[PDB]
Design a protein around this nucleic acid. Sequence first.
RNA 1: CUGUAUAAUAU
Length: 410
Amino acid sequence: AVRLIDLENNASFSKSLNSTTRSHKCTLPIWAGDGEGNVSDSVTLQDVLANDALVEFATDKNGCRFLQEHYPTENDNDVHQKLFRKLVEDRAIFLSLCSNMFGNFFVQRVLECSNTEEQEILTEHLATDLYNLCLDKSACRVIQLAIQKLDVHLATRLSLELRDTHLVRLSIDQNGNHVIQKIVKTLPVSSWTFLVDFFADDDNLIHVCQDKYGCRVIQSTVETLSTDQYAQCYQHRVILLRSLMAGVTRNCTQLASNEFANYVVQHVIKCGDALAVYRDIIIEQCLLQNLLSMSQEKYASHVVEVAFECAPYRLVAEMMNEIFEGYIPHPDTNRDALDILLFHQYGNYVVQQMIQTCVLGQNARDQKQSEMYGMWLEKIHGRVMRNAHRLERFSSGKKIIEALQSMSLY
RNA sequence: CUGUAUAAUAU
């Protein structure tokens, strides 16, 4: 049995002869089309492999649809292996097809059909330029499907590839925000602990939180670290959540009176449970002494609504005492916080929430609490009835008067 | 006279 060394034939001039297309926009080569931009029925995948034209099929829509339809799902199929080897033969060719408007659908298809051995070379290719890939509009979808299908260890390598980068630029990005989120919501916490480290800085937290995309990132991170629940005796997540919530609480005044940041503020009040302690701090450190001023604001009035809805009674009593007896009346008009918020565009929503909290808490176990909630209802009814002649003309006044219909302190 | 998100891919 003499040995035979079979070297490959130098087909240097084949990318040249696949560069010829009928149209200047579609990239499908002239040999594979029927004239109208589609793929001829005589064309098979072995014809793609024989002409070295996976790349040129991939960046054309119909050729990539052909590749995605006829791709063999089984890993021991021959044509599957030759196509995958042609894909991952070159780093630059692979990363280009990932960043192609059309080839990323084929890279996603080979992600759905992959097993572990393919996943290793796929991860090694992606990790070389992962950050700029997450910045790309087409390649970032490939990155999201990777975090979903890649084995945890491979995805972890990928997530820690973003460790010392410009994470604020990634988190405020239109495409990259979804990657960060995917990682946080998909992978175990140790894969992205450095992300919490990046938000240990106050300035990085604000810039990201006060952004149309980064507020979703902060919301996903907080939901994940909190959803841990009480299934842990020693929880490492609590330390991480504490490190983050610290900045939220330090800058919660600016974040509450803000276009995008206020939403995540509502989350730490809406959730309760693991975030209850932080909710209370929030109510003690920017809500109190400010409730009139933020209830006349467009963004922070929702924060005052959810704080009135979800607080414990000890804090709710402080808010009610602040609205009823906490401000000096206006020197010209003799008008307190309640008289202002009855006829205010945003503040009437706050007053309806106070009414709703009082009628829900009148069904409480503690009698004193029920009596106190009623007292506050009788205060509200006294102001409303006095002002009811003007308030009846408004829609908000109709909703308010319908809310105090047929009540009883008992 | 009612009030804030509408989170990124097939030329």
